[PDB]
Chains A and B, each alone.
Chain A
Amino acid sequence: MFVSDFRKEFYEVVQSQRVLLFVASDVDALCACKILQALFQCDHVQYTLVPVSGWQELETAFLEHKEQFHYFILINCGANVDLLDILQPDEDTIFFVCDTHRPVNVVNVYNDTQIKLLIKQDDDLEVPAYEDIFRIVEQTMRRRQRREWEARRRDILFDYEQYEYHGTSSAMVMFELAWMLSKDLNDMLWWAIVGLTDQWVQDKITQMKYVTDVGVLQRHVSRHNHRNEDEENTLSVDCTRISFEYDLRLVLYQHWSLHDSLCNTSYTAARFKLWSVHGQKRLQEFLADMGLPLKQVKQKFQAMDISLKENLREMIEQSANKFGMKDMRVQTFSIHFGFKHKFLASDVVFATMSLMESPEKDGSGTDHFIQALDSLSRSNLDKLYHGLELAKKQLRATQQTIASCLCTNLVISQGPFLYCSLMEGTPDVMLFSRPASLSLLSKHLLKSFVCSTKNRRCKLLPLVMAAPLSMEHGTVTVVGIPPETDSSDRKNFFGRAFEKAAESTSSRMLHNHFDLSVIELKAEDRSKFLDALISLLS
Chain B
Amino acid sequence: MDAAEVEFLAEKELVTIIPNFSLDKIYLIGGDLGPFNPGLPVEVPLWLAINLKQRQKCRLLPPEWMDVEKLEKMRDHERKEETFTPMPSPYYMELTKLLLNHASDNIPKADEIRTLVKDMWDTRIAKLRVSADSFVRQQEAHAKLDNLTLMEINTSGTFLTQALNHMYKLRTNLQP
The reply to whether A and B meet directly (CB within 8 Å) is: yes
Using CB atoms and an 8 Å cutoff, list the residues of chain A in contact with chain B: 42-43, 182-185, 231, 234-239
Find the B residue at minimum CB distance from A184: B56
- Look across to chain B and name the residue whose beta carbon is closest to the beta carbon of A188: B56
Sample of 9 more A-B contacts, CB < 8 Å, known A234-B109, A237-B111: A43-B55, A183-B56, A185-B56, A234-B108, A235-B109, A236-B104, A236-B114, A238-B110, A239-B105
Nearest Cβ distance between residue B54 and chain A, in whole angstroms? 7
Chain A residue nearest to B20 (CB atoms) is A182
- B100 beta carbon closer than 8 Å to chain A: yes
Instruction: Mark each residue of chain B from 98 to 120: 1 if its CB lies under 8 Å from any CB of chain A, else 0.
Output: 00100011011111101000000
A183 — nearest CB in chain B belongs to which residue?
Answer: B56
Which 6 A-B residue pairings sit nearest by Cβ, starting from the closest? A236-B110, A183-B56, A234-B109, A42-B55, A236-B104, A236-B111
| Residue pair B55, A236 in contact (C-beta under 8 Å) | no
- Choose among B20, B55, B104 the residue that contacts A238 (Cβ–Cβ < 8 A): B104
15 A-B residue pairs with CB within 8 Å = A42-B55, A43-B55, A182-B20, A182-B56, A183-B56, A234-B109, A235-B110, A236-B104, A236-B107, A236-B114, A237-B111, A238-B111, A239-B104, A239-B105, A239-B110
- Residues on the A chain within 8 Å of B110, using CB: 235-236, 238-239
Q: Which residue of A lies closest to B107 (CB)?
A: A236
B150 → A minimal CB distance (Å)? 26
**Contact check: which of B20, B54, B56, B100 meets A236 at CB < 8 Å?**
B100
Smallest Cβ distance from B57 to chain A, in angstroms?
8
Chain A proximity of B53: nearest CB distance (Å): 11
CA distance A239 to B107 in the complex (A): 11
The complex places the Cα of A231 from the Cα of B107 at a distance, in Å, of 11
Interface size class, chain B: 10 to 19
Which chain A residues lie closer than 8 Å to B105 at the CB level?
A: 235-236, 239
Q: Give bound CA distance, A188 to B154, whole Å.
A: 38
Shortest beta-carbon distance from B146 to chain A in Å? 32
Contact residues in A for B100 (Cβ distance below 8 Å):
236
The docked-state distance in angstroms from the alpha carbon of A238 to that of B112 is 11
Interface centre among B54, B108, B114 (most CB of A within 10 A): B108
In whole angstroms, how far apart are the Cα atoms of A238 and B55 in the complex? 21
- Which of B20, B54, B55, B108 contacts A235, CB < 8 Å? B108
Give A492 to B105 CA distance when docked, in angstroms. Answer: 46
In angstroms, Cα B110 to Cα A237, docked, is 8
Residue of A nearest to B56 (CB): A183
Closest CB of chain A to B25's CB: distance in Å? 22
Q: CB-CB contacts of B23-58 with A at 8 A, as 1s and 0s?
A: 000000000000000000000000000000011100
User: Which chain A residues lie closer than 8 Å to B55 at the CB level?
Assistant: 42-43, 183
Closest chain B residue to A178 by CB distance? B56
Closest-by-CB residue of A relative to B113 is A236
CB distance from A90 to the nearest CB of B (A): 34
For chain B, residues 73 to 123, give those with C-beta under 8 angstroms from any C-beta of chain A: 100, 104-105, 107-112, 114
CB-CB < 8 A to B112: which residues of A?
Answer: 234
A43 neighbours in B (Cβ, 8 Å): 55
Residues of B with C-beta under 8 A to A237? 111
CA distance A11 to B108 in the complex (A): 35
Chain A CB count within 10 A is highest, among B20, B56, B108, B109, for B56
Nearest to A237 among chain B residues (CB) is: B111
Once bound together, how far apart are the Cα atoms of A43 and B55, in whole Å? 7
Tell me the complex Cα distance, A185–B106, Å: 13
Chain B residues near A231 (CB, 8 Å)?
108
Distance (whole angstroms) from the CB of A353 to the closest CB of chain B: 30
Instruction: Please indicate the chain A residues that have their CB under 8 angstroms from the CB of B20 in the complex.
Output: 182
Given the complex of chains A and B, what is the CA–CA distance between A43 and B54 in angstroms?
Answer: 10
Could you tell me the distance between the alpha carbons of A234 and B106 in the complex, rounded to whole angstroms?
A: 11
**Cα-based distance from A201 to B100 in the complex (angstroms):** 36
Q: Which of A42, A235, A238 contacts B56 (CB 8 A)?
A: A42
Q: How far is the CA of A184 from the CA of B54 in the complex (A)?
A: 11
Q: Please give, as numbers and ranges, the residues of chain B lying within 8 Å of A238 by CB-CB distance.
A: 104, 110-111
CA distance A184 to B55 in the complex (A): 10
B41 CB to nearest A CB, Å: 19
- Chain B nearest CB from A184 CB (Å) reads 8
- Which of B20, B105, B114 is the most central at the interface, judged by chain A CB atoms within 10 Å of its CB? B105
- Per the bound structure, the CA–CA distance linking A42 and B108 in Å amounts to 25
Contacts of A183 in B (CB 8 A): 55-56
Across-interface contacts of A239 in B (CB, < 8 A): 104-105, 110
CA of A235 to CA of B111, assembled, Å: 7
Contacts of A234 in B (CB 8 A): 108-109, 112
A236 to B62, CA, bound (A): 14
Cα distance A184–B56 when bound, in Å? Answer: 8
Complex contacts, A42 vs chain B, CB 8 Å: 54-56
In the complex the two chains form, what is the Cα distance from A236 to B107 in whole Å? 8
Chain A hits for B56, CB < 8 A = 42, 182-185
A145 to chain B: closest CB distance in Å? 59
How many whole Å from A510's CB to the nearest CB in chain B? 45
Contacts of B104 in A (CB 8 A): 236, 238-239
Q: Which residues of A contact B54 (CB under 8 A)?
A: 42
Q: Which residues of A contact B109 (CB under 8 A)?
A: 234-236
- Give the nearest-CB partner of B68 in chain A: A234
When distances are taken between beta carbons in the complex, the residues of chain B under 8 Å from A184 are 56
CB distance from B99 to the nearest CB of A (A): 11
Name the residue on A nearest B55 (C-beta).
A42
Q: Which residues of B contact A182 (CB under 8 A)?
A: 20, 56
A390 to B105 CA separation, bound complex (whole angstroms): 34
Q: When chains A and B are docked, how far (Å) is the Cα of A466 from the Cα of B13?
A: 66
| Complex Cα spacing A237 to B105, Å | 10
Complex Cα distance A42/B52, Å? 9
* Nearest-Cβ distance from residue B173 to partner chain A, whole angstroms: 52
Q: In the complex the two chains form, what is the Cα distance from A307 to B29 in whole Å?
A: 65
Nearest chain B CB to A13 CB, angstrom units: 20
| A185 CA / B54 CA spacing, docked (Å) | 11
